[PDB]
Amino acid sequence: MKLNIAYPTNGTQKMFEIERRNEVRLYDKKIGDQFDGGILGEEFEGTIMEITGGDDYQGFPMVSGHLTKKRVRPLLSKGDAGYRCRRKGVRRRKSVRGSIVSEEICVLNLIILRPGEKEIDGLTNAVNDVSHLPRKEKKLRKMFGVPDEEKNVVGYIRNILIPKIRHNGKRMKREQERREQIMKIRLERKRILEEERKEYLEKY
């Protein structure tokens, strides 16, 4: 079974491969059951790996919450592994597998939790790029440490160096105005009301 290993700390993946002598040691292990990497081959020694998923020979995925080695067919809804929902309120019966490894799984998905003293080529060397930069202003301030009243938070960072910086600048200003005149109207409604109470209470 070809393995699909990933190192989250460096953010990198690559497709590995093993033979059916060490393959038989993986059987009867749950999703989230993980072990020492030396069992698989040689270069994986001294590592701590982890199991997270896998497919079978027909494409169907393994999901948690079933605890069987056979193929089931439940009724799944929006937010469920095994279904990709498009209409609102719709549910589908669709086949999946259980959370236990056996001779049916075609590909395993793993996780390098602690590297070893050796050097796996495409995983322990590179350090890949992040993809997005934060947009919330509290989170932006804690990334670079701009606590000086922050005075203009984007312009502060543009000088510290070209990288373009997007941010929720406009969205803070719309809502800032919306709940400022809403206080303006609460005064008019109340003020214009008590004039009529007294003027009404005058005559009668």
Binding site: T9, G11, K30, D33, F35, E50, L113, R114, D129, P163
Partner: protein
């Protein structure tokens, strides 16, 4: 070599010792002996028989699926994005 697992008692069956029974829906259940096919015919629930494994984990004598496997692992190295490779904050 194992033939399969008993669908009533939960125990491993040696190669050449069970009988598969296919039902009308296409479901093939595997049993070990006539001690077990009789309990299915009478409609007894396996959790009321103390030598089965579904009865030992119902009463908490011993769970049949150990999980955790000691899983003591943490690391959070930081990386760069496109040109800010050396942030130095």
């Amino acid at each position: 070599m194992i033939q399969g697992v008993s669908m009533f008692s939960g125990r491993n069956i040696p190669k050449g010792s069970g009988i598969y029974e296919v039902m009308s829906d296409g479901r093939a259940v595997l049993t070990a002996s006539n001690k077990e096919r009789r309990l299915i015919a009478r409609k007894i629930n396996p959790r009321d028989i103390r030598w089965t494994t579904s009865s030992r984990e119902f009463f908490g004598k011993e769970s049949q699926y150990v999980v955790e496997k000691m899983n003591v692992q943490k690391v959070k190295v930081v990386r760069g994005f496109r040109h800010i490779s050396a942030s130095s904050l």
